[PDB]
Task: inverse folding
């Protein structure tokens, strides 16, 4: 069965610099070694879910080297949006530790939005939980048009974050493919 | 049995030279392509010294105003794409290399970026200039060419295979090392002991030996090398002694802690080794031992070796000692 | 050990097919989140069925992006024909979904053949995925595809043994990646 929700906070956090780092050679076993490092990265991110403060976070899937998660699938009334941002900071703490041991400079680029979504499975093969909707499309656009080391949020999302005590900055007005002109913000660290 | 060895260390420590010894010792048309590389070292050495003369503080002056014209020459061809290397070049170079000023500037070469094979190639210009010139084994050892990317080298010592991996030691290169961490028999960390009075190329401020120490700590305490042992090569042992005995650049002026240091009891000096030298080389080793002592007990160890990579004779000795460590420990 | 165990395995002689809806962000804007997930499901259910008949193994579904590879898990020298047959059926399937629904759906089919790494990543929420330069190419063949037809590389044509009629694709002029990598494309009839 497919359930409908009203307020869900979706998130996409990419590592743009990976695609370049990945190369297929005989020394690195046709690129297997590069995938071994991603497996370490994605694994470090995953164990944050075991922390008590992140019990409300749901890892949906992993697109490439992009980590997709969402909060509010279990339902200070809007705290779930503020929490997703807290998780964004945590992924940076983890990605930075990976940098310290692999002598790299990988930086995270985040995009968060919120709204109505549709949860459930799809197709005829495997029981894979996924969330759909415009809310999810925009979150992904908030990540693809973002800046490294920044959490880009939509306008509506900016309001809610401010109420919870967060500060924001106006990225400007950019044309998002398919959606038109949206005004976006950048959460202040 | 097969062993996979990875060479780690900062830029110019002596990694690529160690692989050239494995070829000379256990592996062995191309020798003619290295000529072009050797001539480049020569060109880069002369121009770097000359160009540095006016920038030092205080500026060093030529002893023969005649050479001022030759100075003008070297510079006019500094960044020329493909230099044909005419007979004039070698002449100008040689005259400059004999000028006391150019020599005084060379003595203070630790204050600007200069290649290690400088004094060696400049001393044999009359040999490299010939058209019938054939590079010696020692010539290839000294020749310098930056390493970029990863390189594998397979060899054999008494029907036992060894895969050697050579990587770039410069900051930007380090990011590829990770690709070899998994399934490594042991690590060979190389250090430029003689580089205590120099600075790295990347920023022109961080002390070279300190960059080595920090890098070692980063490798020793790495989360993916928790059980991999490290064979430490305190390379450039020849230049360390020459520097210590010359007394121009004092070791305690860079690393203050030296003043409160005495040679250890278990110290085994070389026959005919100066007390000053002994005390110096063991000091540098102890710095790296202080790091390896504090962590990863029993899981992995560190084995120090005094090394001079361009001494085909010395490398046989210490590599056979390594072959011992590897087999004796079941690695 | 020191590196988390990695459940990945290399595989040569495989075909990777990618499909994507054109203007999906635009579509999710017009109709209700419910109807969208329903029309999107009507399509994927049929695809998943066709995947079994054509000897293809479906990988994931990222919004409107659908991908499956032939020649896995068990090696199949018939591979490249499976993906072509898959896309063939896919196109008709989309035609009927557009027919009974009344929704403007169109898709781009991109196929390529080469080696592929496969397995899973991380610790939580595992989903069988594939990675490799060749996989990256199949994806770009879809982006650089032509709406309604089947875009394939020369590598794939060499595994077809001359059974399908094609025409000059011109993928180099529709996608920067295919040009910069000197890829010769073709369109099936
Ligand atoms: N005198 C002397 N010169 C040495 C010694 N070891 C290396 N050299 C010289 O130092 C130079 C640099 O050594 P090299 O091995 O090329 O550095 P590297 O560590 O490989 O450098 P990289 O490729 O990471 S950037 C070479 O000219 C080499 O001959 C040594 O023990 N004594
Ligand atoms: C991990 C590296 C590399 C190169 C491996 C690879 O083939 C990919 O994972 C594919 C193509 C591939 O896994 C198929 C799915 C999808 C989602 C299309 C991937 C992304 O485009 C990845 O890039 C991004 C941007 O994450 C990419 C290209 O990344
Ligand atoms: N559940 C999901 N999982 C993963 N990615 C998703 C999911 N839902 C949506 N997406 C994403 C983010 C936006 C993307 C669909 O838009 P896409 O980038 O394909 O553009 P588009 O369909 O508007 O146009 P086009 O494909 O023609 O360029 O798919
Ligand atoms: Cl060094
Ligand atoms: Mg080198
Ligand atoms: Mg689309
Ligand atoms: Mg898409």
Result:
């Amino acid at each position: 069965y497919h359930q409908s929700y009203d307020c869900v906070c979706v998130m996409f956090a990419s590592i743009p610099d990976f695609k370049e780092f990945y190369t297929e050679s005989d020394v690195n076993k046709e690129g297997l070694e590069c995938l071994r490092l991603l497996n370490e990265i994605i694994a470090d991110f995953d164990d944050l879910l075991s922390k008590p403060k992140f019990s409300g976070v749901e890892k949906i899937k992993t697109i490439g080297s992009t980590y997709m998660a969402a909060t509010g699938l279990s339902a200070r009334q809007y705290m779930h949006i503020g929490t997703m941002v807290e998780f964004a900071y945590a992924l940076v703490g983890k990605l930075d530790a990976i940098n310290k041991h692999s002598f790299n400079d990988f930086k995270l680029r985040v995009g968060i939005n919120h709204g109505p979504v549709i949860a459930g499975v799809i197709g005829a093969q495997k029981p894979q939980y996924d969330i759909w909707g415009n809310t999810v499309n925009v979150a992904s656009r908030m990540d693809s048009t973002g800046v490294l080391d920044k959490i880009q949020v939509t306008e509506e999302t900016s309001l809610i974050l401010q109420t919870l005590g967060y500060t924001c900055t106006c990225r400007g007005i950019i044309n998002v493919k398919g959606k038109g002109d949206l005004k976006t913000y950048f959460v202040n660290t | 049995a097969t062993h996979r060895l990875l060479l780690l260390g900062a830029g110019e420590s002596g990694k690529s030279t160690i692989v050239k010894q494995m070829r000379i010792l256990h592996v062995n048309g191309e020798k003619a392509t290295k000529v072009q590389d050797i001539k480049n070292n020569l060109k880069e050495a002369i121009e770097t010294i000359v160009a540095a003369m006016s920038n030092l503080v205080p500026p060093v002056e030529l002893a023969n105003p005649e050479n001022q014209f030759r100075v003008d020459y070297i510079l006019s061809v500094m960044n020329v794409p493909d230099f044909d290397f005419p007979p004039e070049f070698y002449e100008h170079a040689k005259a400059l290399w004999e000028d006391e000023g150019v020599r005084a500037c060379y003595e203070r070469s630790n204050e600007y970026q200069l290649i290690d094979c400088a004094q060696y190639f400049l001393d044999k210009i009359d040999v490299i200039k010939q058209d019938d010139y054939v590079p010696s084994d020692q010539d290839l050892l000294r020749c310098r060419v930056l390493t970029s990317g990863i390189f594998e080298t397979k060899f054999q010592v008494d029907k036992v295979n060894f895969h050697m991996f050579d990587v770039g030691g410069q900051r930007d290169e380090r990011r590829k090392w990770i690709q070899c961490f998994n399934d490594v028999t042991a690590i060979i960390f190389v250090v430029a002991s003689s580089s205590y009075n120099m600075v790295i190329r990347e920023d022109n401020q961080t002390n070279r030996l300190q960059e080595a120490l920090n890098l070692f700590k980063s490798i020793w305490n790495n989360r993916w090398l928790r059980t991999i042992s490290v064979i430490l090569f305190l390379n450039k042992q020849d230049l360390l002694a020459e520097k210590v005995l010359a007394g121009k650049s004092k070791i305690e002026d860079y690393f203050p802690e030296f003043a409160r240091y005495t040679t250890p009891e278990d110290a085994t000096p070389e026959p005919g080794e100066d007390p000053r030298v002994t005390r110096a080389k063991y000091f540098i080793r102890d710095e790296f031992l202080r790091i390896s002592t504090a962590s990863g007990d029993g899981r992995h160890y560190c084995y120090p070796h005094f090394t001079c990579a361009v001494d085909t004779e010395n490398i046989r000795r210490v590599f056979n000692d390594c072959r011992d460590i590897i087999q004796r420990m079941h690695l | 050990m020191m590196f988390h165990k990695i459940y990945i395995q290399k595989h040569d002689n495989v075909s990777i097919l990618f499909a994507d809806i054109e203007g999906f962000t635009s579509l999710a804007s017009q109709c209700t989140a419910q109807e969208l997930v329903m029309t999107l499901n009507e399509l994927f259910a049929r695809f998943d069925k066709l995947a079994a008949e054509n000897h293809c193994l479906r990988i994931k579904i990222l919004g409107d992006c659908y991908y499956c590879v032939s020649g896995l898990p068990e090696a199949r020298a018939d591979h490249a024909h499976c993906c072509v047959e898959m896309g063939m059926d896919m196109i008709e399937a989309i035609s009927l979904v557009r027919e009974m629904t009344g929704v403007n759906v169109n898709m781009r089919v991109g196929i390529h053949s080469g080696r592929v790494h496969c397995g899973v990543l991380g610790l939580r929420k595992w989903q069988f995925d594939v990675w490799s330069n060749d996989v990256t190419l199949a994806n770009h063949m879809e982006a650089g595809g032509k709406a309604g037809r089947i875009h394939i590389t020369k590598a794939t044509l060499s595994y077809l043994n001359g059974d399908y009629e094609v025409e000059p694709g011109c993928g180099g002029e529709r996608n920067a990646y295919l040009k910069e990598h000197s890829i010769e494309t073709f369109l099936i009839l």
Observations:
- The radius of gyration of chain B is 21 Å.
- Residues C 20, 63-65 surround magnesium ion (ligand 7) (CB under 6 Å).
